[PDB]
UniProtKB/Swiss-Prot annotation:
Expression by tissue: Highly expressed in brain, skeletal and cardiac muscles, and expressed at lower levels in lung, liver and pancreas. Isoform 2 is not expressed in cardiac muscle. Isoform 7 and isoform 8 are only expressed in muscle.
Biological role stated in the UniProt entry: May be involved in the formation and stability of synapses as well as being involved in the clustering of nicotinic acetylcholine receptors.
Subcellular location: Cytoplasm; Synapse; Cell membrane
Gene that encodes it: DTNA
PTM notes: Phosphorylation of DTN-1 on tyrosine kinase substrate domain present in the C-terminus.
Disease: Left ventricular non-compaction 1: A form of left ventricular non-compaction, a cardiomyopathy due to myocardial morphogenesis arrest and characterized by a hypertrophic left ventricle, a severely thickened 2-layered myocardium, numerous prominent trabeculations, deep intertrabecular recesses, and poor systolic function. Clinical manifestations are variable. Some affected individuals experience no symptoms at all, others develop heart failure. In some cases, left ventricular non-compaction is associated with other congenital heart anomalies. LVNC1 is an autosomal dominant condition.
Description of its domains: The coiled coil domain mediates the interaction with dystrophin, alpha-catulin and utrophin.
Zinc finger (ZZ-type): 9-63
Family: Belongs to the dystrophin family. Dystrobrevin subfamily.
Binding site for Zn(2+) 1: C14, C17, C38, C41
Binding partners and assembly: Interacts with dystrophin, utrophin and the syntrophins SNTA1, SNTB1, SNTB2, SNTG1 and SNTG2. Interacts with MAGEE1. Binds dystrobrevin binding protein 1. Interacts with CTNNAL1. The interaction is required for correct localization of both CTNNAL1 and DTNA.
SS bond partners: none
Name of this protein: Dystrobrevin alpha
Binding site for Zn(2+) 2: C29, C32, H51, H55
Length: 63
């Protein structure tokens, strides 16, 4: 990554794919500790030992 601290601060960035473009949204899994994804991540579908592909995501407006 690479950016300056003279403008944008804590912009819309994913947790995994850490996207930059402003297209997706904040999608927080249903039942989980810390699982947030964006439109893309969702479209493709992500998961792991912790998060299960059978976990739905909710749309929130925080980031
Ligand atoms: Zn993402
Ligand atoms: Zn989950």
């Amino acid at each position: 990554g690479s950016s300056g601290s003279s403008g944008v601060f804590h912009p819309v960035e994913c947790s995994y794919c850490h996207s930059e473009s402003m297209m997706g949204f904040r999608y927080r899994c249903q039942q989980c500790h810390n699982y947030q994804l964006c439109q893309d991540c969702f479209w493709r579908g992500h998961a792991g030992g912790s998060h299960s592909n059978q976990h739905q995501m909710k749309e929130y407006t925080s980031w």
